[PDB]
Structure 1
Amino acid sequence: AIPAFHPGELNVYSAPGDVADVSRALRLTGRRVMLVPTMGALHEGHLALVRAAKRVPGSVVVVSIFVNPMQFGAGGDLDAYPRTPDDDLAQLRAEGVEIAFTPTTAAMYPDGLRTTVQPGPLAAELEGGPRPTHFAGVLTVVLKLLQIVRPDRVFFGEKDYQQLVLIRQLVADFNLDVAVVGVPTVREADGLAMSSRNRYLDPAQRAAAVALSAALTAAAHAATAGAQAALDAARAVLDAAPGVAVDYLELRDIGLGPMPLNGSGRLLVAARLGTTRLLDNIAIEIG
């Protein structure tokens, strides 16, 4: 028997088998299953993905909420990760979402870490520098969510651009039959990319943090003058801010391969303000 599903209401399932059964039953009834993977503690950045999924005609939106231990580091603080279950579900209800998948760690990893996904070399670069096992954790849990839910489309934010690219690699490499949809980064009024981490910044740091987005947008417009001008413009803006320790500032092609001297690319930056690591990236057209 298929678990109960009440249309127009937020239906919450914790068991993988239950959401798999409902999802399959719904796809047979004329719905297109949209999957929005998250780790909860939802904000407007996450809701933008929700809205993108909801607009697809015939959509039934599945939002997964699961703090994935595998992507935290030997030094990542899993226990400290924000958990606001009640408020998250309230936001999903307000958004018209019909399915929330909230599994336990034991349900996702009943046999602990055994078979896992090993990403390509891109996983060791950029964010993979300080967190070399992070993306293996992300790809492993995303592959599982994709097999459990079997969505028609899965949504990821351009906020985590390297994550998005690695998911496209996972999908191509494993011949997965799902469409990956990237959603533009939601930003605060001054341009700061929305993140739960922004609240950790003190006033001086919050003002200095504007430099990441301002450096990227400056570079995007300086790009008519070439790659080097775009990079130098971005560095100049970051250099005008106090207490911003840049970990990297790199211009790559859109698939994160070598910096192009012409055409489309992506400029990515990561920096530390006190103990808070912030990231941002932007589309760049060279020339």
Structure 2
Amino acid sequence: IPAFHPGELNVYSAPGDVADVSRALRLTGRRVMLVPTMGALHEGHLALVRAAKRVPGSVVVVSIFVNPMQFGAGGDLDAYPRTPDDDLAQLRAEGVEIAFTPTTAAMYPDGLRTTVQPGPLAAELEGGPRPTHFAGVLTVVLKLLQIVRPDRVFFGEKDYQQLVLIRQLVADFNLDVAVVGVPTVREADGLAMSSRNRYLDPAQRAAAVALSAALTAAAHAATAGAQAALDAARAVLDAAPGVAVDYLELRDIGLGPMPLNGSGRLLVAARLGTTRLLDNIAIEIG
């Protein structure tokens, strides 16, 4: 056990350090909350932090780790935004007591050896062109969960497929953690907050409102049925200058091997220049 000062941000890099502190905290009755991130923190991440913080007796651990395993080769890893100074400043301002900032060597001392193989969902949507991406995500989240052993772990609805996959991980491996989904944080015009939004120039930023406009239009059109919802979204995306749609799909809420009934999720991915944006929304049919 190393030093933990309450009411202050404590930064630990060694997995053993945070594990020891987490264990000590949990044994004195504090409930440990985990918020996994890759840093470059914005208000969307802070929504998860605040959700963690309101759990009574909670101590909040925010992990910051840009996980190489979930990146495909081709510059994405090097290009991921890194603003560590701002990140830690934001955590202090939010009254977070623990930041976990491990090294790549500490997380992957043996390279890729034992890993998590996700179910068939990982091959679809985001995983279509990136068939190893979610194995990266599930592997690192499993490790983080084992290191920190939180009572609850927090994920954004922003990455809805990721959230679904984490619930599968938790169910399928009998993990003793509650997964808390947190609603998507949006800019004033509807644009879902993302560390990638910084790559939109003013014109592309203008056009990007089309993703959330399309989804919200769909959600209201859905009283008229699925075809109406999808065609409303398509019309909006089609009206938008320089938006190239990768996919627009309406699925059951579990995204799994079940047909759409009363409750669905509409998911979109689109490119604005080289920037790929995602958004999704709850859809109720009829």
TM bucket (normalised to shorter chain) is over 0.9
- Give the superposition deviation at 1:206: 1.1
**Mapping of residues 136-147 of structure 1, within 5 Å:** 136-147=135-146
Residue 127 of structure 1 aligns to a residue whose secondary structure is helix
Deviations along 1:2-52, one digit per CA (max 9) or x if unpaired, are 211111110110000010010011001110000000001100010000000
Q: Distance in 2 between matches of 1:103 and 1:285?
A: 41
- Give the superposition deviation at 1:260: 4.4
Deviations along 1:205-261, one digit per CA (max 9) or x if unpaired, are 111111100000000000111111111111011011011110100000110136745
Q: Distance in 2 between matches of 1:255 and 1:202?
A: 35
- Give the superposition deviation at 1:75: 2.5
Residue 281 of structure 1 aligns to a residue whose secondary structure is strand
Q: Distance in 2 between matches of 1:268 and 1:102?
A: 31
Give the corresponding residue for 2:99.
Answer: 100
- Give the superposition deviation at 1:126: 0.4
Figure out how many residues of one structure are paired with residues of the other and give that number: 286
Change (3 A) 1:261 1:23: closer
Give the corresponding residue for 2:267.
Answer: 268
- Give the superposition deviation at 1:185: 0.4
Deviations along 1:131-151, one digit per CA (max 9) or x if unpaired, are 111000000000000000000
Deviations along 1:157-195, one digit per CA (max 9) or x if unpaired, are 000000000000000000001000000000000000001
**Mapping of residues 14-163 of structure 1, within 5 Å:** 14-163=13-162
Counterpart contact for 1:36–1:62, Cα < 8 Å: yes
- Give the superposition deviation at 1:85: 1.3
Is 2:203 the partner of 1:189? no
Q: Distance in 2 between matches of 1:77 and 1:205?
A: 20
- Give the superposition deviation at 1:203: 2.1
- Give the superposition deviation at 1:129: 1.1
Q: Distance in 2 between matches of 1:260 and 1:114?
A: 36
Q: Kindly, what percent of the aligned residue pairs are identical?
A: 100
Gaps of 5+ in 1: none
Counterpart contact for 1:227–1:262, Cα < 8 Å: no
Q: Distance in 1 between matches of 2:260 and 2:81?
A: 41
Q: Distance in 2 between matches of 1:166 and 1:259?
A: 15
- Give the superposition deviation at 1:262: 3.4
Counterpart contact for 1:270–1:277, Cα < 8 Å: yes
Residue 192 of structure 1 aligns to a residue whose secondary structure is coil
Worse-superposed segment, 123-132 or 251-260: 251-260
Give the corresponding residue for 2:237.
Answer: 238
- Give the superposition deviation at 1:87: 1.3
Deviations along 1:68-114, one digit per CA (max 9) or x if unpaired, are 00001022521221111111111000000000000000000011110
Counterpart contact for 1:9–1:93, Cα < 8 Å: yes
Residue 79 of structure 2 aligns to a residue whose secondary structure is coil
Counterpart contact for 2:268–2:280, Cα < 8 Å: yes
Q: Distance in 2 between matches of 1:228 and 1:68?
A: 39
- Give the superposition deviation at 1:199: 1.8
Counterpart contact for 2:252–2:260, Cα < 8 Å: no
Residue 5 of structure 1 aligns to a residue whose secondary structure is coil
**RMSD between aligned alpha carbons?**
1.0
Worse-superposed segment, 83-92 or 253-262: 253-262
Q: Distance in 1 between matches of 2:117 and 2:280?
A: 25
Counterpart contact for 1:226–1:262, Cα < 8 Å: no
Residue 87 of structure 2 aligns to a residue whose secondary structure is helix
Residue 8 of structure 1 aligns to a residue whose secondary structure is coil
- Give the superposition deviation at 1:67: 0.5
Residue 224 of structure 1 aligns to a residue whose secondary structure is helix
Worse-superposed segment, 178-187 or 198-207: 198-207
Q: Distance in 2 between matches of 1:246 and 1:202?
A: 18
Gaps of 5+ in 2: none
Worse-superposed segment, 258-267 or 89-98: 258-267
Q: Distance in 1 between matches of 2:50 and 2:148?
A: 19
Q: Distance in 1 between matches of 2:158 and 2:96?
A: 22
Q: Distance in 2 between matches of 1:233 and 1:80?
A: 35
